Structure formats: structure tokens, C-alpha cells
Design a protein around this ligand. Structure first.
Ligand SMILES: COc1ccccc1CNC(=O)c1cc(C(=O)Nc2ccc(OC(F)F)c(F)c2)c(Cl)cc1F
Lengths: 11, 261
């Protein structure tokens, strides 16, 4: 959930 | 004996690099929040939500980016702005020298356990004793109006205010905060980290930078460095009560567009 957004934002 | 040598000049360059990146990632800086809050800006004056009638007018005249309870519509608005803040803080994290050279799973863990502590830090920049700037400065909602929302929503913002009142008394500026927020992100004690030493090494460099920043910027506060580290202790526990309260709400009360796609 938080991970989802962090993972996408990091790419 | 402090000295202007290559080591100090590299810490000032790191401090400036982080400040510039901070300015790109977070359009509403503390300097600008302070200008709005203190009516020392030519910018459009925020709409004040101080009661139920002023909120109803507020939904209309403050434009953001249904549910029949006012208290739920307010909390949801806070949760959407939190999602946005996670994006900007991840963006900021990418600009910290050494951060994208770390194992991606560690990068995710640092940010997963850090963003809440950084949100409460940066929220302080938007607060005074009367309340908090909303919708990047179009709105101002009062502390007492948030307090008046029915349980469990009336207490969601109180601990942020308690923290902000004492944190804002330290009178940090955007230069200080940029380094402070980078020290938080690079915390080697987060649970589930594969490679600690490389994180502590960046944090050591950030700590030296922060120490120099506060010495140069705050001549009348000789132990401000020690004070700021003490606030990271506070913050961890504030996040504990926040997380514990989000449990109650989610399981005792009945989702952002990015979180759907
Ligand atoms: C549409 O529903 C409403 C109707 C009337 C008033 C309002 C709402 C919808 N609620 C809010 O907008 C609302 C938003 C916030 C908020 O959390 N803002 C905020 C700013 C900056 C951030 O970034 C960080 F890095 F500093 C951050 F993470 C979060 C708060 Cl405290 C209270 C609110 F009532």
C-alpha cells in the first residue's frame, strides 16, 4: 500500500 | 576550534545540495508557510475554517485535488494529502547522495518507516497555535475545530499540534530541516534492513552536515544539535500513537486514485 507508492515513485 | 577547510566546505555543499532538492520536492516551504501564517505575503489570503458553517463554505471555496459525515470527509482529505507527501519525500530521498546506490528493498524500508516522522516534521512548518494550512495554503483549519470533530477524529491532529508547538519553538529554517529530514530517512535501526553499515555511513555524513548547519545558523542555541536528535525520539512515539489510532478508525469506521491503479 505505502510500499506500492514508494516502489512506483522510486522508478 | 572550528575552521573553514575542505571538509567543512564539502559539508556546506552537501547542505546546499539537500536544500535545493528540498525546494524542488516541496513547493510549500516553511519560509512561504510563515509568510502566509504571519500575513507578510502579497499572495492570496487563506480561507479560515473555524466552525461548521465556515467548513461548509470551505468545501465550496477551497478547491482540493462523497461521505455524509464532515469528520470523515476531513480525515480522508488528510489521508489523500499524506499519500502525495510520500511521493514528494521519495522524490527528495532520491537526491540524497548515496541513497539510490543502496539495495532497493532497503530504500523501500527507510521510506516505509520514515515518511510518517517526516510528515509530522513538515506539518509543523504549516502550523501555529491557531491551526494548520491546508490545500497548499488556500485554507487554514483551526486546532479547536479539528478537536471538536466526534471521536475518534477529534484527537487525530492533537499530537501533531503538541509536537509542532515545541518543535517550532526551536525556530529551524528550510536549510536546517532539509538536513534534518535526510538524517531521519537514513536510520540504520529500521526493522528489516539487509545492509546497515552503508546506511549508517551516509547518516554519519548527514549528522556532521546537520551539526555544522546548526552551529552556523543558530548562534544562541549551543546544543540545538542534541535537541534535534531528542525530537527524533519524540517523533518515533508520536508515529506509534498515530499508527495505533489508524488501526481503530480503519476497523471501527466504514481510497486515493493512485492506490486504485
Ligand atoms: C474535502 O474535504 C475537506 C473539506 C474541508 C476541509 C478539508 C477537507 C479535506 N481535509 C484536508 O484537506 C486536510 C489535510 C491535512 C493535511 O494533512 N495536510 C498536509 C499538508 C502537507 C503535508 O506534507 C508534509 F510533507 F508536510 C501533508 F503530509 C499533509 C490536514 Cl492536517 C487537515 C485537513 F483537514
Amino acid at each position: 500500500g505505502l510500499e506500492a507508492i514508494i516502489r512506483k515513485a522510486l522508478m | 576550534h572550528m575552521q573553514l577547510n575542505p571538509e567543512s566546505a564539502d559539508l556546506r555543499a552537501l547542505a546546499k545540495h539537500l536544500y535545493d532538492s528540498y525546494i524542488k520536492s516541496f513547493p510549500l516551504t516553511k519560509a512561504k508557510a510563515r509568510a502566509i501564517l504571519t500575513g507578510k505575503t502579497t499572495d492570496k489570503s487563506p480561507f479560515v475554517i473555524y466552525d461548521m458553517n465556515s467548513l461548509m463554505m470551505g468545501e465550496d471555496k477551497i478547491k482540493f485535488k462523497q461521505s455524509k459525515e464532515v469528520a470523515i470527509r476531513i480525515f480522508q482529505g488528510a489521508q489523500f494529502r499524506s499519500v502525495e507527501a510520500v511521493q514528494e519525500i521519495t522524490e527528495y530521498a532520491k537526491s540524497i547522495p548515496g541513497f539510490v546506490n543502496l539495495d532497493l528493498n532497503d530504500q523501500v524500508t527507510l521510506l516505509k518507516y520514515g515518511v510518517h516522522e517526516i510528515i509530522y516534521t513538515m506539518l509543523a512548518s504549516l502550523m501555529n497555535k491557531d491551526g494548520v494550512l491546508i490545500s497548499e495554503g488556500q485554507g487554514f483549519m483551526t486546532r479547536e475545530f479539528l478537536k471538536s470533530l466526534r471521536k475518534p477524529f477529534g484527537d487525530f491532529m492533537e499530537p501533531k499540534f503538541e509536537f509542532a508547538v515545541k518543535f517550532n519553538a526551536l525556530e529551524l529554517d528550510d536549510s536546517d530541516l532539509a538536513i534534518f529530514i535526510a538524517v531521519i530517512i537514513l536510520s540504520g535501526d529500521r526493522p528489516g534492513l539487509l545492509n546497515v553499515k552503508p546506511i549508517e555511513d551516509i547518516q554519519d555524513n548527514l549528522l556532521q552536515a546537520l551539526e555544522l548547519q546548526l552551529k552556523l545558523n543558530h548562534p544562541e542555541s549551543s546544543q540545538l544539535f542534541a535537541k534535534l536528535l531528542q525530537k527524533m525520539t519524540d517523533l518515533r512515539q508520536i508515529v506509534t500513537e498515530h499508527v495505533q489510532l489508524l488501526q481503530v478508525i480503519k476497523k471501527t469506521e466504514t481510497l486515493h486514485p493512485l492506490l486504485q491503479e
